[PDB]
Design a protein around this nucleic acid. Structure first.
Ligand code: ZN
Length: 2031
RNA sequence: GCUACUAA
């Protein structure tokens, strides 16, 4: 990026400097260094000459020197650069800054002065100031004339390297306040106050009394003093803040020492995990569980592991519906024996008989299905009636009627009372997992499963996934394709998939399942069936299977019993009562399952594939809560047990509680138990990779991947990365929303009331010194607040200004999202009236639904609560957008500034109320959400937001960093430590290491000195705080508001009052919880809920110290940061004692914490400091009121846990798996494209977090599978659109119609779904383009499109383009989307929806809205900027029936079934499809394909229509421009192993609602005026201004009068398509893990491309031309130049690196003339360099050719006193093209380029004795700049570099190679606790030249070739063998020159030239033996043939296989020559 | 609950 020379000198100046005024100048010099750097590279980007601080009076003299500068008055300014074209002078003053505030100042200053001579000379002078952003990198130019000149400018600039120097300078001097004084943009500017008057009540409040009670009396007054302090009044802002700092400095200075001095007190005794410590924990766990749960040893109490019973399919019987129905009927009737429900199952088969009348079932059912398939809506009013067939009364296809005559009254009861459990109505029941005869039973269940499921399907291993994605999986990694087959083949896959396909059909049936009906559900298996019994939503089902022989059935613990029938055996499973939410997951279980297996097995050959799948079905299908209780606690139980410092005992003895209800759970528990002990013995089995560090980051970082560790869930060995996956991944198998709300509300309530009681009874004291639970070290707090509050205001002065802007404090409440959102909200008051009326309605609807059930199968309160509970404070649920509307209409909210309204609300609202609703997430331990009043939301907003922008300043806080941005931060901080550790070790041990190499004589004396030295120590505290919210003093936060400098006194009074009320805040127990406790039935022994509510009197309990979970994150997080800031100071004083160095780095995120400590020792042992660090860690937490959970907290020597994002020893790594398990049931079930959109987004996310392409593609397959399974769009399904459309396969069917996503992953990762459309257009620009222009930019290939011929194209090719233009372009672009008939639902709670009723009811008032909205069309798309505007927007919104539904929650489970059932019904309205073709009702999916073709065939494809596609898609979006370029200019290079992974940021490829108001009326309300100009162009170029008006203007003559509906609906479309153009998208933080650091776009592109090709090897990427094009106005000049630079940089270095010094000019001269780099002649590139204005870059090149003149030297010398003859003399002994002396010791620079580019050279061969330097250029292996790599290289690699034309003495011929020394890589151990070797590049000695390397290679490798090709006991001598050699090398020329043969020839050649036998080799033709007659050149193939067989061969590596293949090839080939398949008639003609 | 008619 930047120059290396200036970096080194600026780094040294930071250490050299001591005083702040010296450090000041280093910051000033760094600005100019960046200033010129931007200018140097931009001048080449614009092709102009570079200049610096050139006077304006001289700039005119270049244009017109006839008038002298004295008489003509020119403005005396100092511009940077100038240009004169088109009779206009353009003045340049480039500058790099974040804001244009510094640019407009210099703009108007220049514009004013330049006008003095602008009218004097009558030549207009334009000011062109170019500014670039130093982080986001965006170009900003003010000149409009300059915009039209340069359409696109190349800006791949690097500031990343500049900020590295800034970090160093603001580290040493950043602590000193003398340096902070010098950096200022106003010193300190405090903005306008948010309030006018203070708060008197705050000083009176009893909580403020209680605050000062505990506090000491000097502190009491200080708090008074601090609040009343105004920062704007006193001379400086830090008057008070420093004053209170200096008071507490007595106790602080002492307490910092106190903690630090404990380093000597410590011992080598810390909570370390050990086999016994784990064992002890388990035993106390057993005791706990055996009390807390009812332990059972009986095998009848178990629950099903899986809720399914699979049995082998029967191919002998027919696979057809009607047949199976009767088959199961007779089968069920035929059941023989006696049980409980035997005669019940018997009659059920009897009630589904058809027999003779099989054909009547085929018709009757098809009529009913056809009746429903006609209508969009369901068939209402008409009564469904059954038809008597044999004994059964069929109601629908596979639906029957329960006939009360066919079953006994007693036998009907048995089935429903006992078996189905309809009418059945104290510890939990669990299985003893410590019983070996229970663990046995559990193991035998697995042994049983493996015995049956391992057996193959025997059916074709070809399903949609493999059929359509197999190709794209296989090419990524062939292993995974096979792995997939291995699964699909095995009964495992058929078992799950048939349960999936069966459940889909169980749900589909269960929807219309009545109370007098039992339904039958069949699957792809013709033995497996299911019976769905009447449900009293709840699905009641049994799996009924007809397995072959007895016990050829899989029972996981689900089966009721097997039964013998009259033909075979039939088994019926226990009645399962599951919920649709659970069942859904079972349907998507195969996708979950495949991923599980593939992820585990991936690239690990030691694992048993049949054992992975054996475990996987029991996970992917496990829907019980038994499993979650294992999967979650395991993650910590393993990691704790393999960490260094960690408390396992306590975690296993308290936090671990198995709920082993099922039988898999028992087996899985013991898998975990065992895995805990294996960890302890593997702690030291972890190794640390050899770190190849050579300045600016490291490649080959992180942990060593060694397969020495042991797996957890199955047998085999595993890698660390894989071990971690096996540890953490299990938890993501867990299922969401399993927690029954009835139980959650109780346990959530109980906990809050338990911890509040704790505080009420036990915790009384607030502050303390000894450090105790819920206590803060008040003196230490106040100081550490003061110190940080200073540094978080000194580093940014406008801090109060930044808060106002970024959080919209000044603007009206109606603008901020958090307030105008559709989130849940709590309303307080009295609703006893409507709450009673809303309840009794449902209590009647209860009886309504019961009355109807009494007729068919006779099986069978809010008033009470209010009457019973006296002190019941009444509340209600509402919406956040609705509350705002309510508070405005009743006028308490206004257009007053939101903060100004907040301040008043803090003092107005005095009592705060909060309610909780459960999340019920995948975790077994349930999480609560506290949601209270809207009034509260406003208060917390300010307090939290003020802390937000404060927290952002501190780099330690990470809640500030949105998205997965933390991952890179982990890395950047880990790398800083790995570097520091090395740097510091080399700085101390250098004195000792010198003596070691000196003596190494006797080695017995060396060990004495090698012991007594410095010792490295790294450690990471992977923390997790205990009860961050509940067990935390809220009183401490009062001080943060008090001490605050950027808060006014009248604000400070008001903030603290609200917080004073947030102590007397009440928790409302929601009614649903109170209803559970309403019906007593004997109360709880010790009822905590009743205790706190006084035997249930009030529904409110007061919560004090427990500030509610998530309400004060940032606030608490700043105090956390302040706490860890102390921990730093503690250790940093402790390590100065021992005399060494320490680097502590703390990452803070509310409750999740990570703190990395790196120490270089001298005195005491490493293990002492380990215990010391942990002591002060808890101390640091507890001195601030927070307590650290030592249970979950673990410490490693590498690993970093932080928010579950993991960084290893530099190498960042997340659990790629967790995101692949999302693409299964994560969608809103809207449409085929709409579903896939989010399912592929989940796959895109995996790639970010370092996922292999092979597995990435799997998710893409699964996603498609589920997507197509939802709407019956799979191959062979109903809506299968391959026959309906013209196409070969689903790759060619548009993804809008649902097909497959045919694109490269490197595109899908970037854009996705749209990629599939983009690839179909790039395919064309690689088919329908000529030989010229195709190799050039994409832009050029788009110009040729309008010169194509339409007739050339094919049916499919035409088909895409027609939809792509007439449909896709304008309409998340979908065409097919099913519409529903859903109802609005109950919207009574809403106030705002009532005001729509009143405006709809009263006549005229409706139209009045729409007529008002037409004069303000800004309020159709965006919400109002003012009260009325926002309010009336809310009412209009209700117009949409979709927005009315949006505020109601539909179950995705129910939504899923509704898209299956409504697929054969008319759902897609064609009206909205045909409208576009023209500019009936709903249409069925099948008909939608037909009716699309009837319209499509009519449309016309032109040479223009196609050119609109290539404009609107490619040429419009600068991103799509580059993506297409990257895939056309792509040149994939060297395949390499993924050694070093690094984090990389996604690059850039680039007023809202107020602008649209200035479009409605052209007058705005200055910068916003300029924004409308480009908006005018957008609407005029597309011409959508007229197109919209014409569409309305001709509709009023179509309809008749004035339709207000069309007046708006068409006007809204016009404003919504504006929104996307006007309101710009925020470039959110996206981090991709790549094989190296991506600085700029091009770098990112190359590394991204190469990461998503193969799994085993990543590839480095090249490009012919620049890929970064900006549009279709910008059509090469800037793409050419850089090629010339690359070329000559490459050549000069290749020449001075490898070619002999003596003959380097000749080489260059030969290369320049007859050669070409990247299809451009090197001469033309040289001419481009010579005609350029940066010749100073290529001084040594120009001198060597004789194209260097004095002007260049004079310029070069002026950039950073010379003569030509001086150079001519000086460089008489320096022979290099990359370097010439331009002084006494100053050499010239050529700037080295990478050597992976030399392949892009194409010229005639240059032969040098024997070597062909062209082939050395074209070589891959022999281009490394490492001596050892080339010395220890293969002869196969070198054998390409030989021609020799009969040379001699190989030693002589190698004279044309560099006899200059090469660079070797040396490595050394670092002497850390995690001991690793650093490897770096040295310069070797002298005898390490390129020649000697080649020679040593030749010698070593030829010796091995000789002994392999002896074929006798002689050698490479003895003509008896030379004859054999001649024979073997003869055939090689008379056969076929493939690739294997030629190598042998050239190797033999080499070997014979070496031995001095190259005076005959060239005169070696076929011997006399083989040649019958010498003259008559006849060949005896038979002889030759038998000669090849008669060759013995050798088995020495590496030639053993080489020779073997050669022989076979040559034999086969020879035999081929003979074998000529002649025509049968041919010979019959000749003779 | 969603639907169709009757009734206050
Ligand atoms: Zn030769």
């Amino acid at each position: 990026g930047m120059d290396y020379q200036e970096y080194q000198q600026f780094l040294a100046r930071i250490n050299t400097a001591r005083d702040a005024c010296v450090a000041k100048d280093i910051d000033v010099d760094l600005l100019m260094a960046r200033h010129d750097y931007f200018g140097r590279e931009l001048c080449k980007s614009l092709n102009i000459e570079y200049r610096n601080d050139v006077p304006f009076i001289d700039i005119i003299l270049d244009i017109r020197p006839e008038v002298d500068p004295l008489t003509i008055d020119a403005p005396h300014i100092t511009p940077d650069n100038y240009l004169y074209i088109n009779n206009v002078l353009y003045i340049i003053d480039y500058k790099v800054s974040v804001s244009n505030e510094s640019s407009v100042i210099t703009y108007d200053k220049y514009y004013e002065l330049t006008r003095d001579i602008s009218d004097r000379l009558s030549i207009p002078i334009e000011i062109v100031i170019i500014r670039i952003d130093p982080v986001s990198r965006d170009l900003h130019i003010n000149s409009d004339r300059f915009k039209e000149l340069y359409p696109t400018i190349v800006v791949d600039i690097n500031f990343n390297q500049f900020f590295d120097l800034k970090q160093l300078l603001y580290e040493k001097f950043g602590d000193d306040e003398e340096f902070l004084l010098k950096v200022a943009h106003g010193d300190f500017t405090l903005t306008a106050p948010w309030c006018k008057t203070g708060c008197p009540e705050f000083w009176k409040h009893p909580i403020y009394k209680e605050f000062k009670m505990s506090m000491p009396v000097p502190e009491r007054r200080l708090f008074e003093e601090s609040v009343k302090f105004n920062a704007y009044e006193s001379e400086r802002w830090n008057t008070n803040l420093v004053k209170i700092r200096e008071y507490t400095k007595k106790d602080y200075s002492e307490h910092i020492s106190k903690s630090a001095k404990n380093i000597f007190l410590a011992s080598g005794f810390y909570k370390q995990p050990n086999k016994n410590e784990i064992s002890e924990g388990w035993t106390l766990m057993v005791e706990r569980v055996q009390d807390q749960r009812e332990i059972s040893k009986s095998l009848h109490d178990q629950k099903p592991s899986i809720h399914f019973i699979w049995g082998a399919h029967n191919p002998g019987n027919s696979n057809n519906a009607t047949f199976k129905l009767i088959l199961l009927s007779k089968s069920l009737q035929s059941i023989k024996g006696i049980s409980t429900y035997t005669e019940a199952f018997k009659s059920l088969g009897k009630m589904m008989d058809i027999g003779d009348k099989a054909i009547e079932y085929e018709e009757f059912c098809m009529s009913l299905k056809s009746k429903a398939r006609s209508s969009w809506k369901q068939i209402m009013n008409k009564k469904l009636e059954p038809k008597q067939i044999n004994n059964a009364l069929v109601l629908w296809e596979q639906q029957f009627m329960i006939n009360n005559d066919l079953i006994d009254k007693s036998e009907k009861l048995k089935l429903f009372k006992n078996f189905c459990g309809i009418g059945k109505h104290s510890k939990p029941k669990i299985l003893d997992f410590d019983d070996a005869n229970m663990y046995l039973a559990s193991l035998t269940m697995m042994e049983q499963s493996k015995k049956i499921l391992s057996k193959s399907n025997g059916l074709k291993p070809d399903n949609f996934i493999l059929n359509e994605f197999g190709s794209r999986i296989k090419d990524a990694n062939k292993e995974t394709y096979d792995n997939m087959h291995k699964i699909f083949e095995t009964g495992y896959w058929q078992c799950i998939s048939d349960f999936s396909t069966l459940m889909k059909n169980i749900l589909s049936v269960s929807q219309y399942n009545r109370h007098n009906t039992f339904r039958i559900a069949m699957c792809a298996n013709n033995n497996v069936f299911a019976i769905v019994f009447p449900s009293a939503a709840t699905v009641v089902y049994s799996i009924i299977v007809l397995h072959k022989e007895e016990e050829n059935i899989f029972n996981p613990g689900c089966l009721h019993g097997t039964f013998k029938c009259m033909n075979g055996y039939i088994s019926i499973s226990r009645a399962i009562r599951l919920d649709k939410e659970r069942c859904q997951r079972i349907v998507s279980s195969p996708g979950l399952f495949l991923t599980t297996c593939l992820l585990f097995k991936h690239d690990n050959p030691t694992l048993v594939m049949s054992d992975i799948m054996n475990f996987s079905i029991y996970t992917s299908l496990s829907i019980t809560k038994s499993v979650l209780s294992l999967t979650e606690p395991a993650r910590y139980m393993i990691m704790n047990s393999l960490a260094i410092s960690s408390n396992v005992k306590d975690y296993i003895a308290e936090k671990f509680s198995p709920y082993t209800k099922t039988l898999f759970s028992v087996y899985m528990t013991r898998l975990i138990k065992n895995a805990c002990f294996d960890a302890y013995d593997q702690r030291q089995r972890v190794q640390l990779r050899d770190i190849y560090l050579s300045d600016y980051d490291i490649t080959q970082k992180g942990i060593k991947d060694n397969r020495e560790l042991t797996s957890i869930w199955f047998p085999g060995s595993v890698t660390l990365k894989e071990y971690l996956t096996q540890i953490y991944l299990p938890f993501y198998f867990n299922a969401k929303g399993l927690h029954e709300k009835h139980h959650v509300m109780v346990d959530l309530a109980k906990t809050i009331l338990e911890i509040e009681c704790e505080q009420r009874e036990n915790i009384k004291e607030i502050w303390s010194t000894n450090c105790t639970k819920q206590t803060v070290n008040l003196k230490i707090l106040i100081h550490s607040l003061c110190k940080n509050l200073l540094a978080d205001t000194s580093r940014h002065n406008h801090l109060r200004n930044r808060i106002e802007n970024r959080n919209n404090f000044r603007r009206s409440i109606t603008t901020i999202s958090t307030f105008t959102s559709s989130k849940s909200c709590l309303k307080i008051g009295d609703f006893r009236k409507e709450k009673e009326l809303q309840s009794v309605k449902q209590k009647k609807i209860l009886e309504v639904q019961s009355r109807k059930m009494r007729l068919a199968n006779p099986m069978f309160n809010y008033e009470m609560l209010r009457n019973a509970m006296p002190n019941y404070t009444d509340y209600i649920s509402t919406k956040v957008f609705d509350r705002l509307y309510e508070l405005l209409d009743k006028k308490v909210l206004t257009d007053k500034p939101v903060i100004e309204q907040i301040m008043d609300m803090m003092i107005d609202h005095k009592k705060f109320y909060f309610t909780f609703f459960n999340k019920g997430q995948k975790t077994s331990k349930d999480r609560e959400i506290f949601v209270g009043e809207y009034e509260a939301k406003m208060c917390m907003y300010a307090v939290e937001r003020i802390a937000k922008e404060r927290c952002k300043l501190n780099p330690d806080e990470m809640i500030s960093e949105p998205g997965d941005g933390k991952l890179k931060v982990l890395e950047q901080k880990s790398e800083q430590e790995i570097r520091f550790l090395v740097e510091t070790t080399r700085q101390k041990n250098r004195e000792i290491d010198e003596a070691i190499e000196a003596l190494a004589s006797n080695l017995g004396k060396i060990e004495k000195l090698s012991l007594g030295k410095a010792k490295g120590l790294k450690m990471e505290i992977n923390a997790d705080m205990s009860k961050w919210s509940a067990q935390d003093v809220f009183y401490k936060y009062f001080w943060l508001i008090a001490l605050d400098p950027i808060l006014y006194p009248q604000e400070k009074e008001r903030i603290l009052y609200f917080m004073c009320n947030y102590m007397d805040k009440e928790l409302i127990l929601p009614d649903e919880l109170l209803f559970n406790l309403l019906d007593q039935k004997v109360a709880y022994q010790n009822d905590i809920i009743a205790t706190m509510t006084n035997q249930l009197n009030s529904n409110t309990v007061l919560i004090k110290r427990n500030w509610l979970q998530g309400n004060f994150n940032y606030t608490s997080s700043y105090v956390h940061s302040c706490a860890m800031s102390v921990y730093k100071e503690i250790l940093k004083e402790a390590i100065t004692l021992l005399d060494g160095s320490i680097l502590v780095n703390s990452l803070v995120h509310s409750d999740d914490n990570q703190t990395s400590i790196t120490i270089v020792q001298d005195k005491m042992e490493n293990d002492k400091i380990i215990d010391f660090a942990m002591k002060e860690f808890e101390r640091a937490c507890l001195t601030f009121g927070c307590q650290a959970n030592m249970k979950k907290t673990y410490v490693t020597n590498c690993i970093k846990e932080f928010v579950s994002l993991f960084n290893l020893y530099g190498e960042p790594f997340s659990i790629y798996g967790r995101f692949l398990l999302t693409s299964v049931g994560d969608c809103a079930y809207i449409g085929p494209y709409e579903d896939l959109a989010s399912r592929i987004s989940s796959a895109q996310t995996a790639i970010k977090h370092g996922c292999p392409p092979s597995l990435a593609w799997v998710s893409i397959a699964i996603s498609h599978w589920m997507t197509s399974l939802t709407y019956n769009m799979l191959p062979g399904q109903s809506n299968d659109p391959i026959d309906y459309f013209p196409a070969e396969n689903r790759k060619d069917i548009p993804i809008e119609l649902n097909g497959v996503l045919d694109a490269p992953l490197s595109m899908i990762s970037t854009v996705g779904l749209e990629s599939g459309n983009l690839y179909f257009l790039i395919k064309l620009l690689s088919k329908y383009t000529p030989v010229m222009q195709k190799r050039e930019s994409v832009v050029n290939q788009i110009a040729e499109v309008k010169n194509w011929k339409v007739e050339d194209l094919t049916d499919n090719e035409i088909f895409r383009l027609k939809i792509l233009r007439y449909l896709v372009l304008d309409a998340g672009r979908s065409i097919l989307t099913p519409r529903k008939f859903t109802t609005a639902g109950s919207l009574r709670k809403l106030y705002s929806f009532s005001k729509y009723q009143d405006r709809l009811s009263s006549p005229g008032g409706m139209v009045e809205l729409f007529t008002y909205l037409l004069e303000k069309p800004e309020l159709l798309v965006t919400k109002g900027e003012d009260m009325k505007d926002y309010m009336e927007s809310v009412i209009f919104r209700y117009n949409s029936k979709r927005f009315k539904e949006s505020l109601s929650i539909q179950n995705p489970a129910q939504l899923f079934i509704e898209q299956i059932l409504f697929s054969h019904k008319p759902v897609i309205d064609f009206s909205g499809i045909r409208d576009k073709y023209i500019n009936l009702g709903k249409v069925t999916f099948t008909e939608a394909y037909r009716l699309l073709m009837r319209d499509l065939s009519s449309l016309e494809l032109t040479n223009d229509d196609i050119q609109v596609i290539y404009s609107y898609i490619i040429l419009n979006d600068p991103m799509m421009i580059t993506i297409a370029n990257t895939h056309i200019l792509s040149i994939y290079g060297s395949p390499q192993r993924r050694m070093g992974m690094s984090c990389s940021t996604m690059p850039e490829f680039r007023s809202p609602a107020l602008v649209l108001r200035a479009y409605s009326k052209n007058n705005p309300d200055t910068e916003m005026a300029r924004d409308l100009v480009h908006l005018k162009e957008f609407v005029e170029n597309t011409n959508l201004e007229e197109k919209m008006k014409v569409r309305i203007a001709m509709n009023e003559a179509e309809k008749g009068q004035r339709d207000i509906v069309f007046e708006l609906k068409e006007m809204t479309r016009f404003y919504q398509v504006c929104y996307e153009y006007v309101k710009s998208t925020e470039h959110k933080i996206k981090v991709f893990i790549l094989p190296a650091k991506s600085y700029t776009t091009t770098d990112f592109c190359s590394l991204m491309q190469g990461n998503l090709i193969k799994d085993k090897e990543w590839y480095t990427v090249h490009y012919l031309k620049q890929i970064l094009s900006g549009g279709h106005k910008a059509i090469n000049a800037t793409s050419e130049q850089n090629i010339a630079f690359e070329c000559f940089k490459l050549i000069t270095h290749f020449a001075d690196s490898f070619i002999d010094s003596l003959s380097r000019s000749a080489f260059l001269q030969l290369i320049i003339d007859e050669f070409s780099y990247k299809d451009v002649k090197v001469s033309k590139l040289y001419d481009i360099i010579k005609n350029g204005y940066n010749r100073t870059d290529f001084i040594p090149l120009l001198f060597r050719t004789g194209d260097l003149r004095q002007a260049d030297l004079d310029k070069y010398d002026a950039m950073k006193r010379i003569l030509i003859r001086s150079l001519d003399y000086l460089n008489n002994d320096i022979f290099s093209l990359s370097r010439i002396k331009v002084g006494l010791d100053e050499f010239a620079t050529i700037k080295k380029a990478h050597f992976s580019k030399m392949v892009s050279f194409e010229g005639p061969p240059i032969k040098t004795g024997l070597l062909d330097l062209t082939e050395l250029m074209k070589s891959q292996d022999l281009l490394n700049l490492n001596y050892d790599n080339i010395r220890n290289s293969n002869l196969i690699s070198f054998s390409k570099l030989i021609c020799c034309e009969g040379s001699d003495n190989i030693n002589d011929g190698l004279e044309f190679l560099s006899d200059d020394p090469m660079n070797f890589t040396e490595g050394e151990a670092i002497h850390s606790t995690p001991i690793f070797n650093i490897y770096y590049s040295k310069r070797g000695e002298r005898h390490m030249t390129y020649r000697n390397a080649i020679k040593l290679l030749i010698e070593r490798e030829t010796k091995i070739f000789e002994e392999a090709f002896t074929f006798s006991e002689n050698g490479f001598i003895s003509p008896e063998n030379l004859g054999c050699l001649e024979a073997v090398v003869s055939l090689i020329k008379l056969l076929k020159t493939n690739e294997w043969s030629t190598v042998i020839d050239k190797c033999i050649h080499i070997c014979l030239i070496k031995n001095g036998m190259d005076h005959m080799y060239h005169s070696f033709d076929v011997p006399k033996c083989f040649m019958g007659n010498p003259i008559t050149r006849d060949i005896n193939w038979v002889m030759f043939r038998e000669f090849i067989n008669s060759l013995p061969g050798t088995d020495i590596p590496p030639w053993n296989v080489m020779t073997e293949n050669f022989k076979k090839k040559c034999i086969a080939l020879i035999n081929s020559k003979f074998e000529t398949q002649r025509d049968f008639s041919e010979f019959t003609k000749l003779m």
